Design an enzyme around this catalytic site. Sequence first.
Site, PDB file in Angstrom:
ATOM      1  N   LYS A 261       1.004  14.495   1.516  1.00 51.99           N
ATOM      2  CA  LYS A 261      -0.262  14.892   0.884  1.00 51.99           C
ATOM      3  C   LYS A 261      -0.330  16.416   0.587  1.00 51.99           C
ATOM      4  O   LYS A 261      -1.185  16.864  -0.183  1.00 51.99           O
ATOM      5  CB  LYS A 261      -1.466  14.392   1.727  1.00 51.99           C
ATOM      6  CG  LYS A 261      -1.633  12.859   1.691  1.00 51.99           C
ATOM      7  CD  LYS A 261      -2.567  12.348   2.784  1.00 51.99           C
ATOM      8  CE  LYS A 261      -2.707  10.830   2.882  1.00 51.99           C
ATOM      9  NZ  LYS A 261      -3.455  10.228   1.730  1.00 51.99           N
TER      10      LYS A 261
ATOM     11  N   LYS B 172      -8.705  14.295   3.535  1.00 51.97           N
ATOM     12  CA  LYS B 172      -7.855  13.111   3.650  1.00 51.97           C
ATOM     13  C   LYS B 172      -7.020  13.315   4.928  1.00 51.97           C
ATOM     14  O   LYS B 172      -6.971  14.430   5.488  1.00 51.97           O
ATOM     15  CB  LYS B 172      -6.922  12.989   2.457  1.00 51.97           C
ATOM     16  CG  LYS B 172      -6.028  14.211   2.249  1.00 51.97           C
ATOM     17  CD  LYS B 172      -5.892  14.578   0.779  1.00 51.97           C
ATOM     18  CE  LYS B 172      -5.422  13.437  -0.063  1.00 51.97           C
ATOM     19  NZ  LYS B 172      -6.280  13.160  -1.242  1.00 51.97           N
ATOM     20  N   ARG B 173      -6.345  12.261   5.372  1.00 53.84           N
ATOM     21  CA  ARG B 173      -5.481  12.371   6.553  1.00 53.84           C
ATOM     22  C   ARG B 173      -4.389  13.425   6.335  1.00 53.84           C
ATOM     23  O   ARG B 173      -3.866  13.566   5.225  1.00 53.84           O
ATOM     24  CB  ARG B 173      -4.858  11.004   6.906  1.00 53.84           C
ATOM     25  CG  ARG B 173      -5.866   9.984   7.442  1.00 53.84           C
ATOM     26  CD  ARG B 173      -6.376  10.358   8.835  1.00 53.84           C
ATOM     27  NE  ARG B 173      -5.300  10.330   9.838  1.00 53.84           N
ATOM     28  CZ  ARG B 173      -5.099   9.364  10.747  1.00 53.84           C
ATOM     29  NH1 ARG B 173      -5.901   8.293  10.825  1.00 53.84           N
ATOM     30  NH2 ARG B 173      -4.069   9.468  11.595  1.00 53.84           N
TER      31      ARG B 173
ATOM     32  N   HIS C  69       0.762  -1.229   0.000  1.00 51.76           N
ATOM     33  CA  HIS C  69       0.000   0.000   0.000  1.00 51.76           C
ATOM     34  C   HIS C  69       0.796   1.283   0.000  1.00 51.76           C
ATOM     35  O   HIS C  69       0.204   2.352  -0.126  1.00 51.76           O
ATOM     36  CB  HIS C  69      -0.929   0.026   1.205  1.00 51.76           C
ATOM     37  CG  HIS C  69      -2.082  -0.892   1.068  1.00 51.76           C
ATOM     38  ND1 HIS C  69      -3.202  -0.560   0.344  1.00 51.76           N
ATOM     39  CD2 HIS C  69      -2.276  -2.150   1.521  1.00 51.76           C
ATOM     40  CE1 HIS C  69      -4.050  -1.572   0.377  1.00 51.76           C
ATOM     41  NE2 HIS C  69      -3.512  -2.548   1.085  1.00 51.76           N
TER      42      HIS C  69
ATOM     43  N   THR D 244      -8.032   6.755  -3.045  1.00 55.68           N
ATOM     44  CA  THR D 244      -9.398   6.339  -3.330  1.00 55.68           C
ATOM     45  C   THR D 244     -10.355   7.502  -3.244  1.00 55.68           C
ATOM     46  O   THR D 244     -11.342   7.537  -3.978  1.00 55.68           O
ATOM     47  CB  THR D 244      -9.906   5.240  -2.368  1.00 55.68           C
ATOM     48  OG1 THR D 244      -9.678   5.644  -1.022  1.00 55.68           O
ATOM     49  CG2 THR D 244      -9.229   3.992  -2.617  1.00 55.68           C
TER      50      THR D 244
ATOM     51  N   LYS E 237     -13.751   8.887  -5.614  1.00 56.93           N
ATOM     52  CA  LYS E 237     -15.048   9.263  -5.055  1.00 56.93           C
ATOM     53  C   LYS E 237     -15.512  10.588  -5.628  1.00 56.93           C
ATOM     54  O   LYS E 237     -16.690  10.717  -6.016  1.00 56.93           O
ATOM     55  CB  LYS E 237     -15.008   9.354  -3.529  1.00 56.93           C
ATOM     56  CG  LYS E 237     -14.653   8.038  -2.831  1.00 56.93           C
ATOM     57  CD  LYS E 237     -14.335   8.254  -1.364  1.00 56.93           C
ATOM     58  CE  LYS E 237     -13.580   7.060  -0.773  1.00 56.93           C
ATOM     59  NZ  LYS E 237     -13.217   7.332   0.605  1.00 56.93           N
TER      60      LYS E 237
END
Length: 811
Positions: A548, A542-543, A351, A650, A654
């Site tokens: 990120k 998101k986290r 992952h 993911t 969405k």
Amino acid sequence: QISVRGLAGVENVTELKKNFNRHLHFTLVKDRNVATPRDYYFALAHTVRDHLVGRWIRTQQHYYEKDPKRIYYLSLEFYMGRTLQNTMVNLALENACDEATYQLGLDMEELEEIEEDAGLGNGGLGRLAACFLDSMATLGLAAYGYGIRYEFGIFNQKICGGWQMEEADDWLRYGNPWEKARPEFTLPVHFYGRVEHTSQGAKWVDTQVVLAMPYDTPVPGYRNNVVNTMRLWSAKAPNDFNLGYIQAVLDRNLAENISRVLYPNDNFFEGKELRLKQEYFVVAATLQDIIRRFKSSTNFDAFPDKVAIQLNDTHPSLAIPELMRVLVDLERLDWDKAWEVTVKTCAYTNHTVLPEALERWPVHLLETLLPRHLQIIYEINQRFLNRVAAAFPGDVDRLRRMSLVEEGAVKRINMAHLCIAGSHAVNGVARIHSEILKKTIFKDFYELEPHKFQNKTNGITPRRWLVLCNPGLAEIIAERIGEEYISDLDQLRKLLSYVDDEAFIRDVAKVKQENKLKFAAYLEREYKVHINPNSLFDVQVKRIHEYKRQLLNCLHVITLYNRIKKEPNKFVVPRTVMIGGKAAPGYHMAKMIIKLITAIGDVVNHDPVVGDRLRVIFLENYRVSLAEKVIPAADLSEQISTAGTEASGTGNMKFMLNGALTIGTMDGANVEMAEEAGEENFFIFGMRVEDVDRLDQRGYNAQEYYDRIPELRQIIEQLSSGFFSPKQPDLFKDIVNMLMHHDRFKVFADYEEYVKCQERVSALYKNPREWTRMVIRNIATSGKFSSDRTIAQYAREIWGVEPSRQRLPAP
Ligand SMILES: *Cc1c(COP(=O)(O)O)cnc(C)c1O
Ligand SMILES: O=C(O)c1cc(O)c(O)c(O)c1
């Protein structure tokens, strides 16, 4: 009311009404004079649950009779969210229950809001596991999700004075109507002890016993009457445990702590003993269950024809040596036969390539906790390295690179190397990531066994992430192309033929605007925040992580603010910029980033010159149920990780399915999304993977960007000098210092191209009709990113089983 939600037949509505009243009276022991909305939610949940159990019992009976190959999906996280609406959608009950509850004087949407999220995951990995269970049931696979029933899931996030505060997520407080305790199938798990070698082989003795009690949750397929099982283990002390008397009873808590709390780290390895106990606990209980079920159907040659074990990341990697231990020490198979069975049974999904996420357990921990497993691991390693030596003679560096044992100050076991050695298949989660695995981190392993390495691009379920959360969009699509797309998402391609249809364009745009008004109202109600619903909804949820690059978003937001202050009377496209997500409690930098976002908010949102042209909102307590509200409301999806760091994503998918356009880097699944929709229909910017490598070779110097970009310099001077923190001028010095001197993720290198790409977004939004046409082109090409497609690929290329859309018999 709307066709996708099914029929409200008079017979059905009548029967739901009486069962609702029956549960309120007999189950809840209430009358309508004392019942709260919570009691009404529970009456409904029990009424819906009764419709599952008939299908649940016959599904498992069917598997017993037919004895198909069974798929065991092992994960330490299942991020399930709410179950009530999902269950109604999958059983075709949503309109009937709406009508039934309406006729009792109740608003069903209000009752839905009372259900707690089952928050047994951190983010992407946990949510993906939940998506996958839904797709496996929909595709008629004999699949079981196995995990841990954590008493406390991911913490609830509170923001106090702009700072994250954590509180315990006591999700079982009011009970969980969806699970069934199965104390009759309780199994022992062993820890500690020591190894004795007899003439009869090795024996693991003097162990401490913890009991594993299973709780089963039903997982219904989409309108096919298949109901699969998620079995989650809870830790219990044995009744002779510690057995002055009072203290011995209280010390039972020590053992039961194993299932107490989910580790709140997303994509980060913390080598704590309790975490290792959780990992072994799930593995050991699960494998006994698997073997029990296999024996009820000497000859372990057929074991891989009847069982597939999928390892979700390395967290359940101890399945490999545990399966060897059981086969060798207890069933008395010879090593080579046992190993053959193991390899053919197990497969591993990777992952992430970030080094800080890699599980590398200290040998001394394994030595103390799981002494037999350490011996098995050493033996696996020795036989593995003998194969490497024969394939590449003299290549001594390869030997130490490939070893499962890492030498150093502390010796460690590399669990990813263990998973590769003991699995017949290893996959990444998006094409670019799977290629990165073969080129860089697992290059050596790919050269030895090329056949093992696969790609399985992630996907999301169109049940939860379209029908359930965006009924309006699902309906206007169903009007044109019917309902078959809900379990065959490629049919969305038929929407290309409506890209010039003026009615469709208008309907798509109306659904978005209705979603936006609903979400704007939600914000006022629960959080005293008043937003312009005609603004562009620019969302990054998101986290919180450095990779990120929430900080890059922040720099853009401040650029917009500064540009307005410089030319106040120039027109700019109004924006509501929303950022949400949790930081791990000990991740100090992530916590500072949250504080920065709220601080920018404090300045921007109260500047009268800005007006309602720019708003910055931190969305508190981001979780699955908040995702279901904000994603249908978004115009712009921020997917801006540094190229090469986001394995897949993911969230990105969405947003694509729900009518937002994407601004992002060529990272993870963004690459395949842009490829499906056309690059013209995507807002791509920034360095590619190859540009990042080139920058690393020369050496990243952030000062260069600071010196040549005056707008960037101004933002840094604002942060440093206390513009966003007047009472504490130096509050953001760690952020500034990181950006200038220690930025692993090259925020400044993508700043100019990001800002320019954001201008193009703004330009397009000014032309509603062309914005909406590009949206239609995204929605229509999102079919590849169904988890039904993903799971069909796992089933055929890894597990060796055929999917099926065929109904089982009702009721
Ligand atoms: C989908 C989802 C994620 C994963 O989002 P990414 O942007 O892919 O990291 C995380 N958390 C929740 C609650 C989700 O629904
Ligand atoms: O960089 C870190 O120290 C860090 C990163 C994380 O993702 C995390 O969950 C954590 O607890 C610490």
